[PDB]
Design a protein around this ligand. Sequence first.
Ligand SMILES: CCCCCCCCCCCCCCCC(=O)OC[C@H](CO[C@@H]1O[C@H](CS(=O)(=O)O)[C@@H](O)[C@H](O)[C@H]1O)OC(=O)CCCCCCCCCCCCCCC
Ligand code: SF4
Ligand code: SF4
Ligand code: SF4
Lengths: 156, 55, 110, 206, 393, 68, 193, 147
Amino acid sequence: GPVGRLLQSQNLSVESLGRDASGVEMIKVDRDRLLAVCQTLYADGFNYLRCQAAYDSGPGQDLVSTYHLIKLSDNADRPPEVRIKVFVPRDDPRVPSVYWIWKTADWQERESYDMFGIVYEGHPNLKRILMPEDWVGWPLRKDYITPDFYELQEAY
Amino acid sequence: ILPGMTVKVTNPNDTYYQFQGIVQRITDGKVAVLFEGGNWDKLVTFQASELEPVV
Amino acid sequence: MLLKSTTRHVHIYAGHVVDGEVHPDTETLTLNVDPDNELEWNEAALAKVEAKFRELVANAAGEDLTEYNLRRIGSDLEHFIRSLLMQGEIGYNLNSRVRNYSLGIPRVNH
Amino acid sequence: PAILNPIARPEVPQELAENIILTSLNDVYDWARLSSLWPLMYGTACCFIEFAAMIGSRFDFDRFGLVPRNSPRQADLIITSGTITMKMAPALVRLYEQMPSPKYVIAMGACTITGGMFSSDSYSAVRGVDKLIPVDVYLPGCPPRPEAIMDAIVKLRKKIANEHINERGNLAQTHRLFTAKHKMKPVPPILTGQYLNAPSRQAPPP
Amino acid sequence: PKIETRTEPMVINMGPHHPSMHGVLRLMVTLDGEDVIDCEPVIGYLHRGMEKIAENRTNIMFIPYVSRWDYAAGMFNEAVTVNAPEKLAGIPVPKRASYIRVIMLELNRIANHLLWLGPFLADVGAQTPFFYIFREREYIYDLFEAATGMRFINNNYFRIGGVAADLTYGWVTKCRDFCDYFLPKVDEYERLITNNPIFVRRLQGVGKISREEAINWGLSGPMLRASGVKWDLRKVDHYECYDDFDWDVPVATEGDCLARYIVRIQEMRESVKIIRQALDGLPGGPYENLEAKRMLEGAKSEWNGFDYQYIGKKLSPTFKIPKGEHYVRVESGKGELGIYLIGDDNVFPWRWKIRPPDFNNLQVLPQLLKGMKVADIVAILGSIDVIMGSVDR
Amino acid sequence: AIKKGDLVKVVAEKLANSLEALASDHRYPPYLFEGRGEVVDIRGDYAQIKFPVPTPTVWLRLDQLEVA
Amino acid sequence: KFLNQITNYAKEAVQSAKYIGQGLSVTFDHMRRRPITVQYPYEKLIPSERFRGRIHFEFDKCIACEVCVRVCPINLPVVDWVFNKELKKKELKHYSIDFGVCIFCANCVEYCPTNCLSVTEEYELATYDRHELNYDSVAMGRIPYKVTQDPMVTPIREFAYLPAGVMSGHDLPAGAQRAGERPEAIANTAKSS
Amino acid sequence: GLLAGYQFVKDLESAGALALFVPPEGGFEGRYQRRLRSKGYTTLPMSAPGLGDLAAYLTQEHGIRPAHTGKEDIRVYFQPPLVTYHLENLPPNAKGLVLWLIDGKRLSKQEFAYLAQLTQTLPKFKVVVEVGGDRVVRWEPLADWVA
Ligand SMILES: CCCCCCCCCCCCCCCC(=O)OC[C@H](CO[C@@H]1O[C@H](CS(=O)(=O)O)[C@@H](O)[C@H](O)[C@H]1O)OC(=O)CCCCCCCCCCCCCCC
Ligand code: SF4
Ligand code: SF4
Ligand code: SF4
C-alpha cells in the first residue's frame, strides 16, 4: 500500500489488511510499536485523527483499537487518509496512548476505555466519561450482563 | 356514501380540497376517508356533505 | 457529601436522620420506604421489609460504598416490595392522590 | 392471591366539608393556584426544545399564567422533558423533593412515561419517570406538538381545580425510616477538580 | 449558617440542571478571583446507549433512533445513517433525491445555526432574540411538517435508495417565499447586533485556538473554519450534488468567539444561496409540474426515468447490509459526523459507532478556559454549540 | 443440542471461571437462572441470548448453557 | 498619546448611545405588529397532510402478518392471532399498541400491506393514568378528531398551505388555496393549447 | 354566576348521567367535581379515549395485553371490571360512585346511549362526560343530547 510501503523504508514492518470499500487502506500495527508508527506518520503529514474508538472483534476472540488518519491540507481535494488497527488480546492487555503525539485521544480513548475496558498506557485522566464512574462492566463488550436494576426492569 | 367507495373532497375551506381517497369507516353521519399518498396512509374524518362519490 | 439510592418508595442514604437532616456518616444506611404513600402498609409488612433490608445490607456486604452498590441494594429492596404487593400483603393507597399504578395494575391471578 | 396488586379498601370514609362559605373559599384557593403555575426550567433532551417552542411567540404559555422559573424553590410544576438516564435519576428526584409541597409533575414525551424508544436494549435509561416521582399527567409522543403540551396543561388545570383544602393531609411524607450498620470500606471520590493541573497532563511518562 | 471564606482556589459546580438550552453538563470549575484555573467537564448525563442499540436493530428500525444524536438538525445524522449502508451496497441514488436531500440538509443547517444563535445572543445580552429565532425557526418546522411527517427531529424522511417520498405540491414556491423572507434577516441580525461596541468587546479575544492547535485538537466544525482552515467535508469529499452550486466556504483567521459567530452567520447566509440555487434546478422542478408531465406523457417518456424518481428501488426491511467496514462522513451543523459501520453478513451491524463533532469540539473546554474570566464561561460554552444528544457517544 | 430458540439457562459456575465473564460484574442478576433464555443466533461456538428483560442481548458460549 | 484615547472614548460612547437608541426604536416598533401567537385552545393549528398522529386500525382489514411488529423500532404492536383450522386462515384475537411506548414514526403504517393501519391528526392525547394509553382493537378506530369540525376553534393553516407571498395565516380570507395549481389542473390547461 | 351552589349534585342524582360543556381551558369544572366529592360521592376520571367496548371495560372483565417489546412473549392480565371493582372499594359512608370521562367528544352516540342506560341499572353509579363545548360550564342530561 502507498502508506504501507511509506513506512517500509523506515525499517519497521506492519501487516496489510487492504482497502475497505472506501479506498482507505488498513494496516495492522502491532500493539508494542504503535507509538513508532504513529510518530513516523505524524512526521509524514498525518496530523488529524477523526476517529479512535475500539471494537470487539468477536464474543471472546479479542478487542481492536482502530485509529484513523488524514493529511488535512487547506482547500484540499480527496486526501490519502490512511487508517491503522491494533489487536489487543482480550483478558489482560491494553494499548499505548497516542494523546501525546496528537490529541483528541483524551476523550476518545477515555470513551473506549469506558465502553470496552481497553486501558491506555500513559493516558492522562483515564476515567469514565459516560457510564457513571462507580460503574463496573465495560458495557459495550459483546458479552455484558446488565445488572438487575429496578429502573431498568419495565414500565409495568 | 358507503365504505369502500372512492370519493373526492368538495369544500374550498379545507386543507384536503380536491383530494381523493377511500372511505374506511362511517359512524354517526360523519365519514373517515383514507388518502393513500406520499408515504403514510392518512385518515381524516369529513362530514357527509364535504365529499363526492367520484366514479 | 451524601451517597444515596433514591427511587420511588425506596430511599437509601448514607447517614443518620437526627431530626430531619441527613448528616453523612459512612456507616448508617438509613432507609425511607414509601415516603409519598403510594401504598398502604401494615405492621407485619414493614417488619418484613426491615428484615429484608437488614439481611441485604449485613449478610451480603464486604464491598465498597460506591453509589453503584447502594443502587444495587435499593433495587433488591424494591423488587421485594413489588413481590409483597403481588402476593397481596400490601396494596395501593387509593387515596385522592395522583394514583398512577407504578408497580402494575390490579389483575385477577388466572 | 385472589386479586393481584390489590387496592386499599380503607376506613374512616372522608371527613369532608359542605358549607357554602368554605367551598366558595376553596374555589379561590384552587383558582389562584392553577392559573399561576410556574414551571421549572428543566430540560434534558429533545423534548425540551419543543417545550422552548411552547415558550416562544408562536404560542406562549404566558397566557394562563406560566412563567418559567430557574430554582426549584419557586417552581410548583416540573415538566420532565427528556430521557432520564441512571446517571441523572438522583439529580431529578433531588430537584423534585427540593421544591415546595403543593407541586405537580407532567411526563412529556414517550421517554418519561414508559421509557420510550429506549425501552429495549438500553442499559442506562430509566424506563419511565413514574418509577421516580408521582406523575400527574402523561402526554405521549416523540416530541409532542407544543399544543399537546398545552393540552396536558389543560388536563392538569382541571385536575388542580379538583383539590380540597380540607384534604391537604394527603400531601406530607410519612417517613417510615429505619437504620442498619454496615461494613463497606468507604472509598475516595474520583470526581474533583484537577483537570489541567493534574501531573499526568504536563509531560508524557518515560 | 455561613461559608467561612478562606484563601484557596474556589470550586463551583455548574451542575446538570442548566437553566438554559445547553443540555445537561456538569462543569466542575475552579477559579482564583474571577479567573479559571482548570475545569473538569462531567459529561454523560444523557448516555442512553445508542451504540449498543444500533447493533441489534435493522436499518429501517434504527433510522428513527438517529434523529436524537445532536437533536436539532435531525437530518444530518439521518443522512449519514442512510449513507453508511448505501456506500457498502453501492446503491445508486437518483439526482432528484440528491437535490431533495441537499435542500433538506441546508434547511437543517439554517435551523441548527438559528438554534445556536438564539441562546448565544441571550447569554451575551437580552432574551428577546430567543423569541425571534423561534418565530423564524418555525417557518422551517412548518416546511418539514409538510414534506416529512413531523417538524424537526423524528422526520425519518431519508431512505437508503433515496428519500421516503416526493415533496408536497405547493412546496417549492413556499420554500422560495421563506428564503426571500429570511435572507434579509441574517443581515438584520448583524444590523441590530454585532456592532454594539460593548457587545463586540465582550467576545473580542476571549476563547482562542491557533490554527495548528485546532488541527491537533481535532475541531472539525466551524470551530476549525474560524481558525483559518478552508476545509469542509462538502468541498473536500465532493458530497453528492455539490460542485453543482456556487461555493464560498467562510473562514475567519483569529479563532475567537467573534470569529465563530461571523463564520456561522456567513454559513447561514451561504445556505440560502445553496437552497435558492438548487430549487431552480431540481431534476423535474416542482412536484406538481413533474406529476403533470408524467400524467401527460410519462407513461413511457423520459420523465418517468430513473434520474427523476425520488427513490431507487424500494428495499425490504431485511436489507442485509454486506460485509466490510468503512467510515462515512457528513459536514453537519457542528462539523463532521462519522459512522464507523462494520457489518458482517446480516441486518444487524457489527459495531455501529458514531463520531459526533460536538464530542471533539468540547475537548477544548478547559484549554479555552485557561484563565479568561468567570463571566465569559457561558459565552465560550455557547460559542461551541454544545448538544448533549451528540455527547452520548 | 442448543439451537433454534431453545430456552437456555446459564448453569451456575462454568460462567464465572472462564475468563470471558470478566466483562460484567462479579455478582450476577437473578434473571440468568430462569428457564427463559431464547437463543437468537449461533456463531459456531458462541450464542446470543435474549433474556426477557429490556436489556441488551448477551453473547455467551454453549459451554455455559443448558437446555433447561 | 492622550487626545487619541479621548477621541476613541467619545467615538465609542456616542456609538453605544446610537446603537441603543436604534434598538429602542426597533422594539417600540415591534409592538404595532399583529401577534403571531396561535392561541391554541381556541385557535388550534390545523396539521399538515402527512402529520403522524395516533394510529388508526381497521380490525376487518388485518391479516395478522405481523409486519407492523417487525418494522417497528421497538416491536411495539401486540398482535394476538390463533390460526384457525378452516383451511389456513389466521384469525386475529387482539391487536393493541401501547401509545405510551409509541414513537410515532409510522413505520407500521408504511408497511401495512392491506391498508389496515393509518395515521391520523390526533395530537391531543393526554391522560392521568398511563395504563389507559394501551389502546384496544376497538379504542383505535374511534373516528379521529377533525379540529375543523369544532364549534369553539378557529382553525389556522400552517406555512405550507398559505397562498403565494402570504406568511402568516391569521387574517386570511375564506377562499385561499395552498400555493399553486394541482397536477390535474396543469394537465387540463396543457390539454387546451 | 361566578359562584355555584349544589344544583349540580341534585341534577346528577336526578338524571344519573350528565354531559358537561366546559370551556376549553379546563380549570372551571374541577370545582363541580369537588362539589360532587364533598357530598359523599367518589369520583374517578379515566379519559374515555382509551377504553374498549365500554361494556367489557366497565361491566365485564377484559384481558389487557401489555407492551412486550421483543422480550416477554404475549401475556394477558385480565384486570377486573373498572366499576364493579370500585363499587366494592367505596369508603364506608359513600353515597355512590360517579364516573368522570374527560374527552367525551371521542366517543360515539352508541357509546353515549350505553353509558346513559348503564346508570339506571347498577344503582350506586352516576356518570359525567365532559363533551367539549360552551364558554360556560353548563350541563345537560346525557339521556338527552342524543337523538
Ligand atoms: C393592603 C391591602 C391589600 C389586600 C389584598 C387584597 C386581597 C384580595 C383577595 C381576593 C381576590 C379574589 C379574586 C377572585 C377573582 C376570580 O375569582 O376570578 C374570576 C374567574 C374567571 O372565570 C369566570 O368564570 C365564569 C365561567 S364559569 O362558569 O366559571 O366557567 C365566567 O364568569 C368567566 O369564565 C369568568 O368570568 O372565576 C372563576 O373562574 C371561578 C372561580 C370562582 C371564584 C369565587 C368567587 C369569589 C368569592 C369570594 C369569597 C366570598 C365568600 C362568600 C361567598 C358566599
Ligand atoms: S421523549 Fe422522544 S423527543 Fe423527547 S428526548 Fe425522548 S426520544 Fe427524544
Ligand atoms: S395491520 Fe398490516 S402489519 Fe399489522 S398485522 Fe395486519 S396486515 Fe400485518
Ligand atoms: S408508530 Fe412507530 S413504534 Fe408505533 S407501531 Fe408504528 S412503527 Fe411501531
